[PDB]
Amino acid sequence: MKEFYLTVEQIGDSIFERYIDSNGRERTREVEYKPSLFAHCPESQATKYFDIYGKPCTRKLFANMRDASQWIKRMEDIGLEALGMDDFKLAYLSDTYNYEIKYDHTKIRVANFDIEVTSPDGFPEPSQAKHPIDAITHYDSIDDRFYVFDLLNSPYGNVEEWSIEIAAKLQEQGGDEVPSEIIDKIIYMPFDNEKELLMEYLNFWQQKTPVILTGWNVESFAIPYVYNRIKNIFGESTAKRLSPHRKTRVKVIENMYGSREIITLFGISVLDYIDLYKKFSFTNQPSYSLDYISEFELNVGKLKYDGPISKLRESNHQRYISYNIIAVYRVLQIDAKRQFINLSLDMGYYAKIQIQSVFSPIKTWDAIIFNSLKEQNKVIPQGRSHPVQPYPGAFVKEPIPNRYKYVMSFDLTSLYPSIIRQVNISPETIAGTFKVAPLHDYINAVAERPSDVYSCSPNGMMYYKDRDGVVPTEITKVFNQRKEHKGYMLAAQRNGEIIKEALHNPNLSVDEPLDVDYRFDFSDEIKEKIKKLSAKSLNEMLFRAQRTEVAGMTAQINRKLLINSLYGALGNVWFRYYDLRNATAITTFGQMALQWIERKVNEYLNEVCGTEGEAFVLYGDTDSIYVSADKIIDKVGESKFRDTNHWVDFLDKFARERMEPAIDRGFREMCEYMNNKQHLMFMDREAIAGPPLGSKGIGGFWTGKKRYALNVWDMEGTRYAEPKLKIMGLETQKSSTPKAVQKALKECIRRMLQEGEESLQEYFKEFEKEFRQLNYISIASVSSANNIAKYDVGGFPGPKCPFHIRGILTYNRAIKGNIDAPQVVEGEKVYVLPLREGNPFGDKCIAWPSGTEITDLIKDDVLHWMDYTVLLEKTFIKPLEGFTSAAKLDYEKKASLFDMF
DNA sequence: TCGAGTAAGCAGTCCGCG
DNA sequence: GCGGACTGCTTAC
Ligand SMILES: O=c1ccn([C@H]2C[C@H](O)[C@@H](COP(=O)(O)NP(=O)(O)OP(=O)(O)O)O2)c(=O)[nH]1
Ligand SMILES: [Ca+2]
Ligand SMILES: [Ca+2]
Ligand SMILES: [Ca+2]
Ligand SMILES: [Ca+2]
Ligand SMILES: [Ca+2]
Numbered sequence: 040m041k042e043f044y045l046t047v048e049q050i051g052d053s054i055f056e057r058y059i060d061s062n063g064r065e066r067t068r069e070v071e072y073k074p075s076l077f078a079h080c081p082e083s084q085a086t087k088y089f090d091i092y093g094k095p096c097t098r099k100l101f102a103n104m105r106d107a108s109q110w111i112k113r114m115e116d117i118g119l120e121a122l123g124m125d126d127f128k129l130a131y132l133s134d135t136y137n138y139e140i141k142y143d144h145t146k147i148r149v150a151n152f153d154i155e156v157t158s159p160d161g162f163p164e165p166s167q168a169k170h171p172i173d174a175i176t177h178y179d180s181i182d183d184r185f186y187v188f189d190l191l192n193s194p195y196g197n198v199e200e201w202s203i204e205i206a207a208k209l210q211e212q213g214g215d216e217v218p219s220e221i222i223d224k225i226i227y228m229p230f231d232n233e234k235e236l237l238m239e240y241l242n243f244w245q246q247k248t249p250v251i252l253t254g255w256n257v258e259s260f261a262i263p264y265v266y267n268r269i270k271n272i273f274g275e276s277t278a279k280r281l282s283p284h285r286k287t288r289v290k291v292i293e294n295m296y297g298s299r300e301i302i303t304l305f306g307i308s309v310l311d312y313i314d315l316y317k318k319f320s321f322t323n324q325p326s327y328s329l330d331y332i333s334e335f336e337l338n339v340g341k342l343k344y345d346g347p348i349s350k351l352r353e354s355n356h357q358r359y360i361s362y363n364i365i366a367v368y369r370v371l372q373i374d375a376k377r378q379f380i381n382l383s384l385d386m387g388y389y390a391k392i393q394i395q396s397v398f399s400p401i402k403t404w405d406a407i408i409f410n411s412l413k414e415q416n417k418v419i420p421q422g423r424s425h426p427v428q429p430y431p432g433a434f435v436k437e438p439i440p441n442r443y444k445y446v447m448s449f450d451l452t453s454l455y456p457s458i459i460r461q462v463n464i465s466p467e468t469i470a471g472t473f474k475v476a477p478l479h480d481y482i483n484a485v486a487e488r489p490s491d492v493y494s495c496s497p498n499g500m501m502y503y504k505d506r507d508g509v510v511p512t513e514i515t516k517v518f519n520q521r522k523e524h525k526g527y528m529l530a531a532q533r534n535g536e537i538i539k540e541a542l543h544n545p546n547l548s549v550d551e552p553l554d555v556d557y558r559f560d561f562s563d564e565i566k567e568k569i570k571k572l573s574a575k576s577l578n579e580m581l582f583r584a585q586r587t588e589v590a591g592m593t594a595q596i597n598r599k600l601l602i603n604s605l606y607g608a609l610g611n612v613w614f615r616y617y618d619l620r621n622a623t624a625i626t627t628f629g630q631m632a633l634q635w636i637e638r639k640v641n642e643y644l645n646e647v648c649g650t651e652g653e654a655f656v657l658y659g660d661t662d663s664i665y666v667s668a669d670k671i672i673d674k675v676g677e678s679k680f681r682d683t684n685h686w687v688d689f690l691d692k693f694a695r696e697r698m699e700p701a702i703d704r705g706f707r708e709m710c711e712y713m714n715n716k717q718h719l720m721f722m723d724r725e726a727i728a729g730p731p732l733g734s735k736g737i738g739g740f741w742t743g744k745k746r747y748a749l750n751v752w753d754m755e756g757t758r759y760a761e762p763k764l765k766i767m768g769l770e771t772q773k774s775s776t777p778k779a780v781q782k783a784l785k786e787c788i789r790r791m792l793q794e795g796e797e798s799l800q801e802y803f804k805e806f807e808k809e810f811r812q813l814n815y816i817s818i819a820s821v822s823s824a825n826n827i828a829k830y831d832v833g834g835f836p837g838p839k840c841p842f843h844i845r846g847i848l849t850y851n852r853a854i855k856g857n858i859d860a861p862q863v864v865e866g867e868k869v870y871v872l873p874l875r876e877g878n879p880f881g882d883k884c885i886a887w888p889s890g891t892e893i894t895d896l897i898k899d900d901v902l903h904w905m906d907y908t909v910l911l912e913k914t915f916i917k918p919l920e921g922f923t924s925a926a927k928l929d930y931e932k933k934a935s936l937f938d939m940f
Numbered sequence: 941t942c943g944a945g946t947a948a949g950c951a952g953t954c955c956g957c958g
Numbered sequence: 959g960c961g962g963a964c965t966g967c968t969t970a971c
Pocket of ligand 2: 450451452454662
């Protein structure tokens with residue numbers, strides 16, 4: 040078995056490494072690693088080492104890591120570049136694992152934990168840790184066991200042992216419904232006192248030391264709480280046993296508004312699942328409580344209990360412990376679906392970094408590029424300081440606000456990475472500059488050809504064509520990986536639609552789901568068997584197909600994120616290869632590419648229609664164009680189509696056989712114009728959209744840039760069983776829009792696009808009539824809440840106080856004096872409701888922590904005084920008015936001459 | 941919100957606009 | 959009442 044690292048740290052002049060040896064055993068070692076760094080040397084001196092620009096370097100081998108660090112400092116004192124990898128543990132990993140790492144996840148100890156702390160006087164601050172830890176559940180991936188540490192005796196109450204038999208039974212039996220599949224995996228340990236609990240936990244931790252440590256808010260709460268509580272009870276040395284090297288650091292995390300403290304445990308890789316979720320999920324959620332996210336991801340019900348959490352252990356210890364266990368399991372269930380741990384491991388081992396560095400694309404790419412260069416005996420440049428400077432981005436076309444009946448969209452494959460590769464954009468491939476014409480002149484192909492020697496971008500930059508830069512070389516590798524996983528994702532998606540179709544005609548039989556790989560398009564044999572299956576089996580297959588789609592989505596979209604972040608890093612001052620010339624080369628080329636192909640598509644369609652000067656491209660943003668297909672449909676005549684699927688087939692074939700070849704020709708000419716290294720502008724059909732055949736639906740509409748809705752029948756080769764709304768930017772897509780209002784606005788849009796004006800009118804009339812019955816949470820707005828203190832002047836709104844902050848200040852006055860009441864936390868999200876004039880809260884709105892019921896003391900008053908009229912006008916009527924005016928229709932029936940009959 | 945980038949939309953404050 | 963200048967927040971890419 041090939042060896043692989045688990046964790047690596049630098050502690051003074053030593054590297055401390057945990058690793059899996061060639062026999063599959065976990066080991067630890069301390070290595071007196073002697074790092075090398077580099078200085079430029081005379082061309083006369085014979086070396087094998089060259090910088091990225093081809094300048095020769097001499098290697099300097101240091102007696103230890105502190106000597107190397109001191110040398111860097113002195114080189115700055117002299118004013119000379121100190122070249123090489125200054126993060127010595129990355130150099131250590133590069134030397135020690137000089138091959139593509141194959142890791143075995145079954146040997147990696149992944150721990151998932153959660154603690155409970157009863158607190159009568161508000162939130163238990165981890166820096167203080169003044170309250171007993173009364174429960175820990177710690178799941179270990181190697182053992183596949185939930186270890187439960189339960190405090191029976193506390194100053195806040197003495198309790199009886201938790202019962203696994205009660206835990207297992209249904210809620211209807213008085214049980215806790217702990218999932219049957221984990222019941223046999225629970226190892227329950229009760230304790231007579233907190234000191235014994237914590238000592239045993241540390242002994243357990245020593246035996247089963249996490250490599251990856253995760254859970255929900257573990258970095259901000261659980262870890263600092265446990266560390267500080269042990270520190271308070273036993274002293275520092277004992278608390279440091281949470282580190283396998285007995286080293287910890289209090290780390291100050293800073294933002295624009297303030298700072299917070301976390302505990303760095305040397306030799307452990309903390310991947311807090313909340314942070315993995317925020318980075319890798321591509322959602323923006325109204326709440327990030329585990330109950331909220333679990334309900335969203337898994338469709339599990341919120342865990343119900345009577346009274347406040349501060350009294351739960353005393354009143355119902357049985358439920359208290361069961362809920363602690365379930366909380367740990369829910370994170371495991373979310374990871375089973377989303378697979379963010381798998382992603383982090385893949386990425387981390389690929390780059391040869393500490394696994395926790397997957398949060399930083401700058402660190403990830405620094406390591407990838409370093410390792411790549413090192414293989415050629417090339418030497419990385421020193422990082423330099425740069426002032427933050429703005430630079431230009433993508434082009435977005437201003438659409439004419441209107442309905443658009445038939446629409447075909449086209450999109451460039453992985454645009455910015457493709458530009459990097461096509462143009463050959465890299466720190467070491469810069470060849471020089473040329474005199475720039477206005478962008479318009481390049482778009483229309485009237486400007487002089489930039490170069491007959493080098494590969495060009497319309498920002499004035501020229502690049503070598505003789506060899507690929509390291510940035511193109513390395514970005515291509517990850518792009519190719521992304522392509523494979525996107526293939527699996529789309530196959531799974533297409534497979535899901537086959538099952539959805541079959542579910543229209545389920546067979547009356549007792550069946551089992553088919554044992555199949557959803558990552559590959561179903562064979563004819565599989566399709567024939569699916570048509571014979573029961574609804575139970577089909578639904579189970581659909582669930583499995585959709586789970587496979589999600590797995591593929593995680594793998595593909597986050598590889599996309601990584602490569603797009605390499606582009607972004609070029610425009611971040613902390614990146615070793617920061618260069619606004621290269622960042623701007625990419626974006627400016629993109630602006631040209633979009634507008635160039637806009638022209639070419641307009642030219643092609645005008646030719647085939649026999650018309651002159653009309654605009655077929657109605658919209659474009661960054662790398663995509665939207666083409667009006669009305670005239671193409673009208674050339675055949677709607678009466679000649681059998682059904683909706685018939686004109687969809689026709690447009691699909693037209694896009695693939697006619698437009699794509701023309702688009703390809705257009706881009707090949709642009710490549711020659713810019714003298715680029717390799718043609719990689721691949722623009723393929725994305726969406727086919729329109730109303731159902733024979734209906735009064737409008738098909739689609741735009742209100743402005745980044746704000747549109749389309750009724751889509753086929754998306755990237757997936758032919759839907761039922762049409763899918765593609766809605767971008769509109770209020771249905773915003774986390775700030777109330778839940779029930781998103782739902783209502785979506786139905787309004789559906790009716791507009793699929794059914795027409797009259798259908799829209801009847802739904803509006805009903806919503807307006809009934810909406811006051813909707814649950815208050817479902818009609819509350821949502822907002823992040825920053826700078827509460829800034830706008831707080833004696834408990835009242837200061838100058839220019841934002842609406843949501845005003846609401847928080849109102850809440851704060853209403854709960855004043857109560858240490859029990861939930862506090863609004865700076866930087867988190869709040870629900871917001873408007874209040875009718877003359878209300879007892881003394882202001883026009885109130886806000887409270889999102890994902891929660893408002894506290895009982897003020898709930899009745901909030902409900903009594905909620906301003907339904909303002910709520911409706913602001914969240915529903917205003918956006919709907921926007922949609923309908925753009926689409927040129929009315930949400931309320933206009934008076935007619937027929938009324939007088 | 942510690943963690944790659946820019947474009948650009950809407951809500952709301954403040955206050956001009958005879 | 960609406961718009962511009964501005965802050966705040968959130969989305970598309
Ligand atoms: O998070 C992002 C998204 C997009 N972009 C830029 C780069 C990207 O190539 C371009 C187009 O984004 P898309 O969302 O269309 N995806 P892309 O073309 O990169 O990939 P895909 O192949 O999926 O379309 O906009 C970013 O820089 N960061
Ligand atoms: Ca694209
Ligand atoms: Ca694409
Ligand atoms: Ca059937
Ligand atoms: Ca796109
Ligand atoms: Ca193609």
